[PDB]
């Protein structure tokens, strides 16, 4: 590959994206390594790998490496006018415990650091296994000509929402305004004090492995 990472937190930017070998949880496992590879970049989006194994810690995220589009800091969700994605990815295989999700971090503090924020929202496009999202399902929402199930939760002081598909979604192209539309007019979310700190897409992983997510295609377009 152009780029490999494979240290926890190795990170390449380029062109308006970045890759974080995010292996944040990594100490609750009892064996197992990740690396993540740049593919190719441009302006118009990237493509990217990553392949792990992990074992023990069963219902502990070891990581979540990500491709996160970058944008100003200062972007209040409600003055933004859309935040389309589109995203093409496939596992080689299916026997892990994993997700694919985009993961969005929100704040009314325009600097808030990059790793939490006051609300989160993610959009689980693949469910492997018996991994749960945080919190509780609370029905089947239709969202962006979709239906899901939304899951809250209480992840210490920061709210989350995570919106699951009913089956794998290897090709999606997304209007992320849509899931804060519905957020803000049917869960009390506070959008317009709320500025936008990052908007990634990845892969939390369990256990299993070894495996690899090829992204074949990440773009993301604010505006
Ligand atoms: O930006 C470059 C610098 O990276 C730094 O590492 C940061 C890194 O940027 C990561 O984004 C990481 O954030 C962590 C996770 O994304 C995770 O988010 C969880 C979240 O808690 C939710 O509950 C949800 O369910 O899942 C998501 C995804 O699993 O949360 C963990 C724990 O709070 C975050 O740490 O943080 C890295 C470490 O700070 C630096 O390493 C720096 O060197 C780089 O320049």
């Given at each position: 590959?152009q780029?490999?990472?494979?240290?926890?937190?190795?990170?390449?930017?380029?062109?308006?994206?970045?890759?974080?070998?995010?292996?944040?949880?990594?100490?609750?496992?009892?064996?197992?390594?990740?690396?993540?590879?740049?593919?190719?970049?441009?302006?118009?989006?990237?493509?990217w790998?990553?392949?792990?194994?992990?074992?023990?810690?069963?219902?502990?995220?070891?990581?979540?490496?990500?491709?996160?589009?970058?944008?100003?800091?200062?972007?209040?969700?409600?003055?933004?006018?859309?935040?389309?994605?589109?995203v093409?990815?496939y596992?080689?295989?299916?026997?892990?415990?994993?997700?694919?999700?985009y993961?969005?971090?929100?704040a009314?503090?325009?600097?808030?650091?990059?790793?939490?924020?006051?609300?989160?929202?993610?959009?689980?496009?693949?469910?492997?296994?018996?991994?749960?999202?945080?919190?509780?399902?609370?029905?089947?929402?239709?969202?962006?000509?979709?239906?899901?199930?939304?899951?809250?939760?209480?992840?210490?002081?920061?709210?989350?929402?995570?919106?699951?598909?009913?089956?794998?979604?290897?090709?999606?192209?997304?209007?992320?305004?849509?899931?804060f539309?519905?957020?803000?007019?049917?869960?009390?979310?506070p959008?317009?004090?709320?500025?936008?700190?990052?908007?990634?897409?990845?892969?939390?992983?369990?256990?299993?492995?070894?495996?690899?997510?090829?992204?074949?295609?990440?773009?993301?377009?604010?505006?």
């Amino acid at each position: 590959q152009q780029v490999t990472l494979c240290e926890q937190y190795g990170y390449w930017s380029g062109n308006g994206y970045e890759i974080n070998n995010n292996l944040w949880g990594r100490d609750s496992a009892t064996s197992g390594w990740q690396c993540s590879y740049l593919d190719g970049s441009s302006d118009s989006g990237i493509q990217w790998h990553t392949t792990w194994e992990w074992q023990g810690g069963q219902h502990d995220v070891k990581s979540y490496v990500y491709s996160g589009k970058q944008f100003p800091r200062g972007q209040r969700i409600t003055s933004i006018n859309s935040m389309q994605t589109s995203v093409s990815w496939y596992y080689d295989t299916t026997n892990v415990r994993a997700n694919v999700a985009y993961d969005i971090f929100t704040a009314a503090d325009p600097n808030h650091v990059n790793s939490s924020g006051d609300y989160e929202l993610m959009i689980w496009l693949a469910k492997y296994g018996d991994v749960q999202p945080i919190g509780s399902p609370v029905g089947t929402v239709h969202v962006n000509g979709r239906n899901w199930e939304l899951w809250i939760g209480m992840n210490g002081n920061m709210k989350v929402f995570s919106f699951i598909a009913p089956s794998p979604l290897n090709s999606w192209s997304g209007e992320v305004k849509e899931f804060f539309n519905y957020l803000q007019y049917n869960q009390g979310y506070p959008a317009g004090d709320q500025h936008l700190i990052v908007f990634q897409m990845g892969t939390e992983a369990f256990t299993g492995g070894p495996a690899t997510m090829t992204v074949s295609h990440f773009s993301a377009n604010i505006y």
